[PDB]
Curated annotation (Swiss-Prot), chain A:
<feature type="modified residue" description="Phosphotyrosine; by autocatalysis">
    <location>
        <position position="162"/>
    </location>
</feature>
<comment type="similarity">
    <text>Belongs to the protein kinase superfamily. Tyr protein kinase family. JAK subfamily.</text>
</comment>
<protein>
    <recommendedName>
        <fullName>Tyrosine-protein kinase JAK1</fullName>
    </recommendedName>
</protein>
<feature type="modified residue" description="Phosphotyrosine; by autocatalysis">
    <location>
        <position position="161"/>
    </location>
</feature>
<comment type="subunit">
    <text>Interacts with IL31RA. Interacts with IFNGR1. Interacts with JAKMIP1. Interacts with SHB. Interacts (via N-terminus) with IL2RB and IL10RA (via its cytoplasmic domain). Interacts with FER.</text>
</comment>
<comment type="function">
    <text>Tyrosine kinase of the non-receptor type, involved in the IFN-alpha/beta/gamma signal pathway. Kinase partner for the interleukin (IL)-2 receptor as well as interleukin (IL)-10 receptor. Kinase partner for the type I interferon receptor IFNAR2. In response to interferon-binding to IFNAR1-IFNAR2 heterodimer, phosphorylates and activates its binding partner IFNAR2, creating docking sites for STAT proteins. Directly phosphorylates STAT proteins but also activates STAT signaling through the transactivation of other JAK kinases associated with signaling receptors.</text>
</comment>
<feature type="domain" description="Protein kinase 2">
    <location>
        <begin position="11"/>
        <end position="280"/>
    </location>
</feature>
<feature type="binding site">
    <location>
        <position position="44"/>
    </location>
    <ligand>
        <name>ATP</name>
    </ligand>
</feature>
<feature type="active site" description="Proton acceptor">
    <location>
        <position position="130"/>
    </location>
</feature>
<feature type="binding site">
    <location>
        <begin position="17"/>
        <end position="25"/>
    </location>
    <ligand>
        <name>ATP</name>
    </ligand>
</feature>
């Protein structure tokens, strides 16, 4: 028996956790004993792309970090990715419900954990391209994990970026200028996405203060197919998301270094970890 | 009796000529005698909707066209008030988009260059009156006769303020991005030289007899990708930055293609003028 092989006949659907256009993530029970005592797992599968999900599987099987969601295995007929289930869900779900428990100190410790997960990923020569609050899972009050790698790409040795073609469905309000303007993704482009994710965490992921809501207030909600060129315009003019309410100026200044127009300027994840760790002393 | 006053009770709707998000142009017969001998007219009006004010903009459109008089600009006839309507002459040949694909055998390069000249004289007259058109495309160039075209729609036209070089726009929902200059796509600024860039695209259309498989949209999408959705425009700006342009139309002589390329200099300041284009074409026609 291979402990990473899940047989389809024992993988019982409970409900949907999420979807995109091409597939979904379901809560299942792997129940070989047929008595409802089996472990709960999160199962990623395609709608009736296959190559890309195989690639995603091979990336996560080989990532080992306490701030990256655990790979458990595969179900093969078509293929399914089996992951650990984190019943608290994402920061987008958990923060609005737990404001009274989660103070600034705990927000700064989630930020450090996200930076350590991201720095580990970058050390393996990967660019995530989708870092947002909806992709950061809560293991417990004290610990978060990056929970999805559906857009993750390898940077070739000697090169600094990966160029993307499949850019329909881009999370434009989290993207660095070089990503919007030229579809180039650097480690520095995840640093920019981390700054937006930090902004979300410090707003307790409220909908009315989302990066999208706030950017649309800046450029206009009408606009349509001109939305991204107007966004690049306002980033060009030097404008950024505003300081979250109640956020100390020195936390805001670490955030702002994620958002230097030029990738080569921007802070590293290691510098961010040292900046936050200084504020927690 | 005001001859520019059309009474609703005599304005008989025939069919739709065109539609936009907020309004339409319709073929009507103005038939006061009630025996179907009255004149056919093209009638611009708003869909019942309206709001962010379509009505104010349509009344501005009417005041712009009422006061334009040029043989290469469609004729104002009047208004109908009831939700106002803009009454214009009807040109049964329609736009270059309808007429050229049906008349390839009759319209040779000499006739194409004469049409180019007549659009440029129309446009030069509009720029002389301090207006920026912002929608110059073959679908907006009407055919009077095999020998004469007229600019037939002014729905986006704007006044450049005195002492100013451009107009900046805010409602850019529904922009004809494949006809737009870099300064238009990047910063929603519209110069006289922006209408020169749109003219170049319009010339390309005329030289391809408006075939749909050779349209500016069809050919740009083949360069950048028919995919892309919301990223289409930033990919287009990228393509233009890198110096790529619509290719020479089949059978187009290089000397005509060179006049078209001077329309498409990246900086507005480096583009040819309408009076330069007229001179260029007239040199080729001698
Ligand atoms: N991260 C995170 C968030 C997700 N998550 C994961 C868990 C978990 N492991 O416990 C979870 N836990 C809950 O919610 C607990 C409160 C109940 N949530 C995982 C992502 N999906 C979105 C999505 C869906 C499909 C595809 C896809 C599939 C195939 C091809 C191409 C794309 C991409 C992304 C959303 C969430 F399911
Ligand atoms: N030019 C030109 C082309 C048009 N045209 C005009 C004629 C004509 N005069 O004979 C015509 N003649 C034919 O076709 C002859 C073959 C049968 N065609 C005029 C433009 N519309 C498009 C359109 C429609 C509404 C609005 C609008 C309205 C209100 C608010 C906001 C927008 C904007 C643009 C398309 C054509 F009707």
């Amino acid at each position: 028996v291979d402990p990473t092989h899940f047989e389809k006949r024992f993988l019982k659907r409970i409900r949907d956790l999420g979807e995109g256009h091409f597939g979904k993530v379901e809560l299942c029970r792997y129940d070989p004993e047929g008595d409802n005592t089996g472990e709960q797992v999160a199962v990623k599968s395609l709608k009736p792309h296959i190559a890309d999900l195989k690639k995603e599987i091979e990336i996560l099987r080989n990532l080992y970090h306490e701030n990256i969601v655990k790979y458990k295995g595969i179900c093969t007929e078509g293929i399914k990715l089996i992951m650990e289930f984190l019943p608290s869900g994402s920061l987008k779900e958990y923060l609005p419900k737990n404001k009274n428990k989660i103070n600034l100190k705990q927000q700064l410790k989630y930020a450090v954990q996200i930076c350590k997960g991201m720095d580990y990923l970058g050390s393996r020569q990967y660019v995530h391209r989708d870092l947002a609050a909806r992709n950061v899972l809560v293991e417990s009050e004290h610990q978060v994990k990056i929970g999805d790698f559906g857009l993750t790409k390898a940077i070739e040795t000697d090169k600094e970026y990966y160029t993307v073609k499949d850019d329909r469905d881009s999370p434009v309000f989290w993207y660095a200028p070089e990503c919007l303007m030229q579809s180039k993704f650097y480690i520095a482009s995840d640093v920019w996405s981390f700054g937006v994710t930090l902004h979300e965490l410090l707003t307790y992921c409220d909908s009315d203060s989302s990066p999208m809501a706030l950017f649309l207030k800046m450029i206009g909600p009408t606009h349509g197919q001109m939305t991204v060129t107007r966004l690049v315009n306002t980033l060009k003019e030097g404008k950024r998301l505003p300081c979250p309410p109640n956020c100390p100026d020195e936390v805001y200044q670490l955030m702002r270094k994620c958002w230097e127009f030029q990738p080569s300027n921007r802070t590293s994840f290691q510098n961010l970890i040292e900046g936050f760790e200084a504020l927690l002393k």
